[PDB]
Amino acid sequence: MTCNIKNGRCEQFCKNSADNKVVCSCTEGYRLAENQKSCEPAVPFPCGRVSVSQTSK
Amino acid sequence: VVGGEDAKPGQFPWQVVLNGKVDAFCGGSIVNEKWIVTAAHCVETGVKITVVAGEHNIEETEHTEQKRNVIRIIPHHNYNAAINKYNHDIALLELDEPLVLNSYVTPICIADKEYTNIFLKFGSGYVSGWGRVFHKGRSALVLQYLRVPLVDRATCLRSTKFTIYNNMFCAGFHEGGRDSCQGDSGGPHVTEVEGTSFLTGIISWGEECAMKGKYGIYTKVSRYVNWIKEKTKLT
Numbered sequence: 326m327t328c329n330i331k332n333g334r335c336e337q338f339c340k341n342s343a344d345n346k347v348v349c350s351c352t353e354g355y356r357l358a359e360n361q362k363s364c365e366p367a368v369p370f371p372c373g374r375v376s377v378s379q380t381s382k
Numbered sequence: 383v384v385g386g387e388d389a390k391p392g393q394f395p396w397q398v399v400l401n402g403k404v405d406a407f408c409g410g411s412i413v414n415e416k417w418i419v420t421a422a423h424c425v426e427t428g429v430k431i432t433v434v435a436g437e438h439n440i441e442e443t444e445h446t447e448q449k450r451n452v453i454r455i456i457p458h459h460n461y462n463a464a465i466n467k468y469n470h471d472i473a474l475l476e477l478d479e480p481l482v483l484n485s486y487v488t489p490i491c492i493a494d495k496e497y498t499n500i501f502l503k504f505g506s507g508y509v510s511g512w513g514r515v516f517h518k519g520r521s522a523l524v525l526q527y528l529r530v531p532l533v534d535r536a537t538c539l540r541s542t543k544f545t546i547y548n549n550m551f552c553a554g555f556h557e558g559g560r561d562s563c564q565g566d567s568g569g570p571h572v573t574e575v576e577g578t579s580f581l582t583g584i585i586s587w588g589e590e591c592a593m594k595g596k597y598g599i600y601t602k603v604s605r606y607v608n609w610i611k612e613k614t615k616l617t
């Protein structure tokens with residue numbers, strides 16, 4: 326794996342590491358999932374997400 | 383915003399409005415509970431400038447609005463190093479009392495220099511504000527938004543007599559008709575990545591809004607992310 330192709334499959338950030346590359350990371354308010362690619366909310370109101378229902382009626 | 387659409391409540395919960403000797407004269411975005419990022423040209427003066435977070439409709443009460451006073455304004459140190467350029471058009475506002483983050487009041491994410499640029503280069507971002515809805519026309523009551531395409535630098539250079547620096551970018555539609563406008567300045571240009579929005583520009587300046595062959599000019603936030611992070615630390 327490299328960051329080249331689809332961001333190393335990282336949801337947010339990717340850095341190339343020795344050969345078997347990809348270390349994914351996340352911005353403040355998120356934590357790297359055990360899954361090691363995805364980013365989980367670590368706070369009640371994490372930056373950059375819409376939490377008010379947008380689907381009303 | 384010319385040719386946009388009404389936001390829904392809580393659609394852009396990082397968006398704020400700036401009020402002073404004129405109401406709704408500029409936008410900004412929430413960096414964190416104590417700090418707003420905006421355009422420096424908006425806040426060359428400070429007399430009771432007030433920030434309203436959680437705003438949607440400017441003439442009604444939604445009971446989500448959080449009003450704060452600004453206690454400190456930090457324009458980028460290099461803003462106004464060169465007369466009337468709008469180069470380095472970004473500023474930070476420190477609020478008197480922290481905002482209470484909730485569904486209507488949420489910070490915008492800010493990535494590092496490398497990834498802000500990557501995200502910008504994705505080539506599509508959202509712009510929002512209560513600025514003019516027609517060139518030389520009235521201001522919006524309900525928050526407006528618009529998806530704007532990134533414009534290639536050579537095109538943008540040819541579109542205006544004015545200097546476009548490496549610290550700026552252009553965005554808009556070749557056909558015109560849809561654009562940011564005056565009153566929107568200082569507000570967010572943002573890129574959504576897997577449902578998480580990142581700040582990729584500040585709405586800065588332009589010539590006649592929505593005119594075919596003219597484009598909105600934005601501050602390139604990637605150039606300033608290290609400064610923003612350094613200034614807005616909480617203790």
Ligand SMILES: COc1ccc(-c2ccc3sc(C(N)N)cc3c2)cc1OC
Nearest residue numbers: 466467468544545564587588589590591
């Ligand atoms: C009437 O048409 C217009 C003509 C010029 C401008 C206008 C407004 C602000 C700035 S800042 C700047 C710079 N950075 N050099 C150039 C420039 C041009 C706006 C207009 O309408 C909205």
Ligand SMILES: COc1ccc(-c2ccc3sc(C(N)N)cc3c2)cc1OC
Nearest residue numbers: 561562563564567587588589590591598
């Ligand atoms: C002096 O009068 C002014 C009039 C207009 C503006 C101003 C502010 C933001 C934007 S975005 C835009 C666009 N075409 N996207 C055009 C435009 C023009 C600034 C001014 O001075 C600070």
Ligand SMILES: [Ca+2]
Nearest residue numbers: 439442443444
């Ligand atoms: Ca209101």
